[PDB]
Design a binder for these strands. Structure first.
Ligand code: ZN
Length: 254
DNA sequence: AGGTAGACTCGGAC
DNA sequence: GTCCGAGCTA
């Protein structure tokens, strides 16, 4: 799930778990648990705590309990569901939180790629994976000025810059390529080569692209290689940039 | 020094 | 066999 989906999850999941008290925690793929590194300590500390809230930071979900916060990343295929403890688990279910009312919060992930970290609430924001996370792309904290400062101080490509979680929180590959197409900037351009207007435009397209998705095939380049650009008809091309599949129109983007 | 490329994980798809 | 990709180590 990308950031917009994660926000949808935060919004829809919260009412389904708020005020519920954890009675048990079951872990079927320990590698998901990153802190405490010992999945036994992770499970034990959460028992007896009541879910008080659910927040989002980038693509991380932050479950707020009585004393602790649980920080979760779903990567590409992770998903949460609330269901009855009486029903069989779905395939690829790796972590289950059991509530005192007979319902369960279940985490599924065919790729087993997601992560979970638990800390005292007051520490969560100053430990991984949240520590050093950059500003929310839809917050005033992420401004053109902030982007410009990071761009001028690096040799990397502009795509690499946007992919950096310390620059902006949870801005996914699809949104990077779409934002760059919409801003008319080739992904392989050196970040420091971007003019003031280009940074202004890129920031604007970033906020609009991810903002529009948060509010909600309407894609210009991502996954469209070999197909005509929707704006100029030039075949969309795909190469590797910053170690990622990168889609662009060689005519629209400069 | 500290920014940077690299390595690393998973399994569905070729 | 090789490909893919989000966010500790030289
Ligand atoms: Zn085009």
């Amino acid at each position: 799930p990308e950031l917009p989906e994660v926000e949808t999850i935060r919004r829809t999941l919260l009412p389904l778990i708020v005020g519920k008290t954890i009675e048990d925690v079951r872990i079927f793929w320990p590698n998901i648990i990153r802190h405490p590194r010992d999945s036994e300590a992770f499970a034990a500390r959460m028992i007896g705590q009541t879910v008080r809230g659910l927040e989002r930071r980038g693509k991380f979900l932050k479950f707020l309990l009585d004393r602790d916060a649980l920080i979760s990343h779903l990567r590409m295929e992770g998903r949460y569901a609330v269901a009855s403890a009486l029903e069989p688990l779905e395939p690829h279910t790796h972590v289950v939180f059991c509530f005192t009312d007979g319902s369960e919060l279940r985490y599924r992930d065919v790729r087993k790629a997601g992560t979970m970290h638990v800390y005292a609430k007051e520490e969560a924001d100053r430990r991984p994976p949240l520590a050093e996370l950059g500003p929310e792309p839809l917050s005033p904290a992420f401004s053109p000025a902030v982007l410009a400062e990071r761009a001028v101080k690096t040799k990397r490509s502009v795509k690499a810059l946007l992919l950096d979680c310390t620059v902006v929180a949870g801005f996914g590959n699809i949104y990077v390529d779409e934002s760059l197409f919409r801003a008319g900037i080739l992904p392989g351009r050196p970040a420091a080569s971007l003019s003031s207007k280009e940074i202004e435009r890129l920031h604007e397209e970033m906020v609009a692209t991810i903002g529009e998705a948060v509010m909600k095939h309407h894609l210009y380049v991502y996954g469209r290689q070999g197909n005509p650009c929707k704006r100029c008809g030039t075949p969309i091309e795909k190469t590797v940039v910053a170690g990622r599949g990168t889609h662009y129109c060689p005519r629209c983007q400069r």
